[PDB]
Amino acid sequence: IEEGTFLFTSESVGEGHPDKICDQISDAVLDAHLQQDPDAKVACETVAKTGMILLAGEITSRAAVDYQKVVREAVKHIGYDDSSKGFDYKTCNVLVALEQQSPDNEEDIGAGDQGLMFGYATDETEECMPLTIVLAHKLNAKLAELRRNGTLPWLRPDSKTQVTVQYMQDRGAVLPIRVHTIVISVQHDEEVCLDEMRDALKEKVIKAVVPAKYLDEDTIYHLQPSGRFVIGGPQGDAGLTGRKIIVDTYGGWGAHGGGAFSGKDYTKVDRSAAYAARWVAKSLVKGGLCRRVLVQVSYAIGVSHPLSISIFHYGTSQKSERELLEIVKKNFDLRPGVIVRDLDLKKPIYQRTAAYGHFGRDSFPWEVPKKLK
């Protein structure tokens, strides 16, 4: 019945979306530093516009990093290798305005600020993520796969997707019923016709990614909805690091306290503690303690242990929220310097996080649920 259902929408963007190009370059720079100096402090912003990658920010590191190589290899990997595509790693301007200095008990490091971090998890997918954002990410990944394997050789790197799912409530848990609307816009070459693109997007992309049970004759498809998308990448739109923070996290679900992730080393609590909060939420759901949960961790400036933790289970547990809090405190140490140790965050793992979401992928330590005792 209409009266018990609701719609929810999330979006994702491809590796060649100009904002995502900047996130990936910022984390490539972070990784390059961490490979040589595990204690590097990095706050690297990237700006991309026609013919230009500009790096700005502050670094304290012993590393000697070849920025030409880091930037150009990232752009090559993304797939911008010719003027005909709007951007070329071989010929773009790389401007380095980074200010790098040399440097002069980790468990007791105080929080740098008073602040709030959220973790979220939901049993609606195997990834413990909202279906809307999982499907949106996977659609972009599929486009990249078919571009790179030459199945759809007219594809270019810039893309955006958006998925609206129709849900019912099930005692605080959310149950996906059907995909209501899908949007896909993807950059393309000058030869391919609109109808062939739209057919490919439906048959080779959407039907390869979205389970058939969620698609029906009423599902609305907006495929290349503005018509041609030849001009794209940084030529079409300036990009900046930290401008896809909702794409990076929960797609509008749960909550967000405000910090961007990319270009920031693990001593930035707004990255590492966000990862740890996710780890807690996912562990609660995978442990069968709730179906859906929002974990809200507050820190007091200069204090290592969290000031307060609140667990909101949306009514999806037999346990009280106080009981869940006891379980969390028994099983997790959310001091910033201890999170870094437990999730091994000094490793150069960050470039992989910078497209397709920081959450919902099994290859990251914060996505391996902890067995709860």
Contacts of a second copy in 234-253 (CB under 8 A): 236-238, 240-247, 252-253
Q: Is 77 in the site for Na ion (CB under 5 A)?
A: no
Query: In the complex, what is the shortest distance from the CB of residue 202 to a second copy, in angstroms, rounded to a whole number?
Result: 15
- Which of the choices Na ion, a second copy, none does residue 351 contact, using the CB cut-off of 5 to 8 A by kind? Na ion
229 is catalytic: yes
Query: In the complex, what is the shortest distance from the CB of residue 130 to a second copy, in angstroms, rounded to a whole number?
Result: 12
Rounded-to-integer distance, Cα 84 and Cα 72, Å: 17
243 is catalytic: yes
Query: In the complex, what is the shortest distance from the CB of residue 295 to a second copy, in angstroms, rounded to a whole number?
Result: 12
Of the ranges 77-85, 92-100, 157-165, 351-359, which one interacts with Na ion (CB under 5 A)? 351-359
SS3 content of the chain, % helix, strand, coil (to 5): 35, 25, 40
Q: Is 352 in the site for Na ion (CB under 5 A)?
A: yes
Which residues have CB under 8 Å from 253's CB, separation 6+? 8, 10, 120, 122, 130, 132, 133
| DSSP of 242-264 | TS-TTTTTTTTSS---S---TTB
Rounded-to-integer distance, Cα 267 and Cα 34, Å: 12
Rounded-to-integer distance, Cα 323 and Cα 118, Å: 19
Spot the catalytic one: 33, 243, 292, 313: 243
Convert residues 196-235 into a mask of x (bound to a second copy by CB under 8 A) and - (unbound). Answer: ------------------------x-x--xxx--------
145 is catalytic: no
Of the ranges 144-152, 223-231, 255-263, 346-354, which one interacts with Na ion (CB under 5 A)? 346-354
Spot the catalytic one: 43, 56, 63, 238: 238
Cβ nearer to a second copy, comparing 132 with 286: 132
Judged by CB under 5 A, the residue of 351, 357, 358, 367 near Na ion is 351
Cβ nearer to a second copy, comparing 181 with 331: 181
Is 58 marked as binding a ligand? Answer: yes
254 φ/ψ sector (left φ>0, alpha ψ -120 to 50, else beta): left
Helices (H), 87-193: 131-148
19 is catalytic: yes
Which residues have CB under 8 Å from 81's CB, separation 6+? 88, 89, 90
Judged by CB under 8 A, the chain residues 53 through 82 that form the site for a second copy are 54, 56-58
Which residues have CB under 8 Å from 83's CB, separation 6+? 91
- Which of the choices a second copy, Na ion, none does residue 288 contact, using the CB cut-off of 5 to 8 A by kind? none
**Strand partners of residue 57:** 44
Number of H helices, E strands in the chain: 9, 14
Neighbouring C-beta atoms of residue 50, cutoff 10 Å: 14
Q: Is 175 in the site for a second copy (CB under 8 A)?
A: no
Is 243 marked as binding a ligand? Answer: yes
Judged by CB under 8 A, the chain residues 129 through 158 that form the site for a second copy are none
Burial zone of 154 (CB within 10 Å; 0-12 exposed, 13-18 middle, 19+ buried): middle
Spot the catalytic one: 33, 72, 156, 160: 160
Q: Position of tokens 């028994």?
A: 330
Judged by CB under 8 A, the residue of 73, 100, 110, 154 near a second copy is 110
107 is catalytic: no
Q: Is 172 in the site for a second copy (CB under 8 A)?
A: no
Judged by CB under 8 A, the residue of 94, 109, 215, 307 near a second copy is 307
Active site residues: 17, 19-20, 45, 58, 160, 229, 237-238, 243-244, 264, 268, 270
